């Protein structure tokens, strides 16, 4: 939604463009669009959902 995905070599974060500030990737930082068969350079990872833990417990 705002910022870009970066990686410190092992983990992926989403940070604002003009100033490093890594954050855990979640549904509050990313919006879904399309599928994985069209984008070029799309990588694989896991996006932690804030809602899942609340309902699981």
């Amino acid at each position: 939604r705002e910022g870009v995905f970066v990686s410190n070599g092992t983990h992926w974060f989403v940070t604002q463009r003009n100033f490093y500030e890594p954050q855990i990737i979640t549904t509050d930082n990313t919006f879904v669009s399309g599928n994985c068969d069209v984008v070029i350079g799309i990588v694989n990872n896991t996006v932690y959902d804030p809602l899942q833990p609340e309902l699981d417990s």
């Binding site: 919006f31 669009s33 399309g34 070029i40 350079g41």
Partner: protein, 50 residues
């Protein structure tokens, strides 16, 4: 100067004109072809119209 992949640069640029950046990535090949054709047309236009 900070490096950045050209594709992500155009994603920022599209964001700058109120278009969701997913539009660029889903249509990257079309945009590239249109841009190349535009450059070719410019080359043709300059070489003929003084």
């Amino acid at each position: 100067a900070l490096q950045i992949p050209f594709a992500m640069q155009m994603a920022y640029r599209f964001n700058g004109i109120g278009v969701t950046q997913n539009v660029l990535y889903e249509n990257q090949k079309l945009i590239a072809n249109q841009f190349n054709s535009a450059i070719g047309k410019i080359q043709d236009s300059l070489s003929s119209t003084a």
